[PDB]
């Protein structure tokens, strides 16, 4: 099964630089044309650059509020790809994408048009001078107070991080159902703060450990914290 | 340039009814559009291309058509797990890196009343000076509801954020989480902590609550 993934976003202040890494698995990278693109603010996906194959002579190509900064480089024999990210811009904190053009038709004047058929998950780059900081892991208990019909509400609130983004699981990603996690919301501090529930049985709460794994990657923070039933 | 233009901006089609999407290029774009869909916190997938040709493993519900400048997408049957924003994307005329704004859509299911649940702070967070008590409405629809804080039956105004997921992918409900923040030295000069929570499916307000140290 192919697939893409990209690796390397993270916090970085302005006028500093970062690499991104686009890493195939599946196909060789090398038949395909390297397009990076970026989202933010809940708008549509937005071309940062491309590198077309080798075969096509291995040049790149750039927005305009990238060009002078960004550089796109691959390497075919490990079916990989990097976009070289220089002189960085709070406007550059966005998503970002890696894809193949596994899409492609011509005609006697050369490439037509392409269509982007393999989506890596993304890599979120914060561009910004505040400084990093980890989050606070508080249990949310469940009681009397958070069962309902013989099902009972526990989590946990990662509180005050910075920046973007956390991940929350349970029991190392046996438990799935019924979780919710919530959308980070940003605090007047300047911080973030996000809370993860999940729902499970009353009769549960006296034997299953329930344990929410926390990862905070700028921060080089894991924390696994166990939730423990409250009495009232 | 070809722009791309998508209508409505949103759309709410009720589960197993069917869902039209417009796309219009603002030059022929002969049969070469391809339409894609991003569920929340995922890259886009790529659902159909040539127009109206579906992607591997692209569910048959799915089906687009047009040519020139006028084309669509539809969903039949939908289900909670369309739930996403589509895009559409030109490739007839070079570059091929352009995608309209997309069309948000959204499921319009029954009436769901919220399951209400409230913790109090942990003695951790407490020890550190802060009191953080969170409210949660669980699995409602639809997505407006009103969220009170009181405390000792005094209505709180402007000590507490809130926020609400996406719609969910397996029963189309949302949930939302209320935190209330507060100093330890606030939060020990008061007994009861309450959310009041009114929403279209409750018949009357509901209350969850608890007096500080009885937990």
């Known amino acids: 099964e192919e697939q893409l993934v990209e690796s390397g976003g993270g916090l970085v202040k302005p006028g500093r630089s970062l690499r991104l890494s686009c890493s195939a698995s599946g196909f060789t990278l090398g038949d395909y044309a390297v397009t990076w693109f970026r989202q933010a603010s809940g708008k549509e996906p937005e071309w940062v650059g491309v590198?077309?194959?080798?075969?096509?002579?291995?040049?790149?190509e750039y927005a305009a509020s990238v060009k002078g900064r960004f550089s796109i480089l691959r390497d075919d024999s490990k079916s990989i790809a990097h976009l070289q990210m220089n002189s960085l811009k709070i406007e550059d904190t966005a998503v970002y994408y890696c894809?193949?053009?596994?899409?492609?038709?011509?005609?006697?004047?050369?490439?037509?048009?392409?269509?982007?058929?393999?989506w890596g998950p993304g890599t979120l780059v914060v561009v910004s001078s505040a400084s990093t900081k980890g989050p606070s892991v508080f249990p949310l208990a469940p009681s009397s107070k958070s069962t309902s019909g013989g099902t009972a509400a526990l989590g946990c609130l990662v509180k005050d991080y910075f920046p973007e983004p956390v991940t929350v699981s349970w029991n190392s990603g046996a438990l799935t159902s019924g979780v919710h996690t919530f959308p980070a919301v940003l605090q007047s501090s300047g911080l973030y703060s996000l809370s993860s529930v999940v729902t499970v049985p009353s009769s549960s709460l006296g034997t299953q450990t329930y344990i929410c794994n926390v990862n905070h990657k700028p921060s080089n923070t894991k924390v696994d914290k166990k939730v423990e039933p409250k009495s009232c | 340039e070809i722009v791309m233009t998508q209508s409505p901006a949103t759309v709410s089609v009720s589960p197993g009814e069917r869902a039209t999407l417009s796309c219009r290029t603002s030059?022929?774009?002969?049969?070469?559009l391809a339409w894609y869909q991003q569920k929340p916190g995922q890259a886009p997938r790529l659902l159909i291309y040539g127009a109206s040709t579906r992607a591997t493993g692209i569910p048959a519900r799915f089906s687009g058509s047009g040519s020139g400048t006028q084309f669509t997408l539809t969903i039949s049957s939908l289900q909670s797990e369309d739930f996403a924003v589509y895009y559409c994307?030109?490739?007839?005329?070079?570059?091929?890196?352009?995608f309209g704004r997309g069309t948000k859509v959204e499921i319009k299911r029954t009436v769901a009343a919220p399951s209400v649940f409230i913790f109090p702070p942990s003695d951790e967070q407490l020890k550190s000076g802060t009191a953080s008590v969170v409210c949660l409405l669980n699995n409602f629809y639809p997505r407006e509801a009103k969220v009170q804080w009181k405390v000792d039956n005094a209505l709180q105004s402007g000590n507490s954020q809130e926020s609400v997921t996406e719609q969910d992918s397996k029963d189309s409900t949302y949930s939302l989480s209320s935190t209330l923040t507060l100093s330890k030295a606030d939060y020990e000069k008061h007994k009861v902590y309450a959310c009041e929570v009114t929403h279209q499916g409750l018949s009357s307000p509901v209350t969850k609550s608890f007096n500080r140290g009885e937990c």
């Open positions: 894809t193949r053009n596994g899409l492609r038709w011509y005609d006697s004047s050369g490439p037509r048009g392409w269509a982007f058929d393999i």
């Open positions: 590198i077309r194959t080798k075969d096509e002579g291995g040049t790149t």
């Open positions: 030059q022929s774009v002969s049969n070469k």
């Open positions: 994307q030109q490739y007839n005329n070079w570059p091929p890196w352009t």
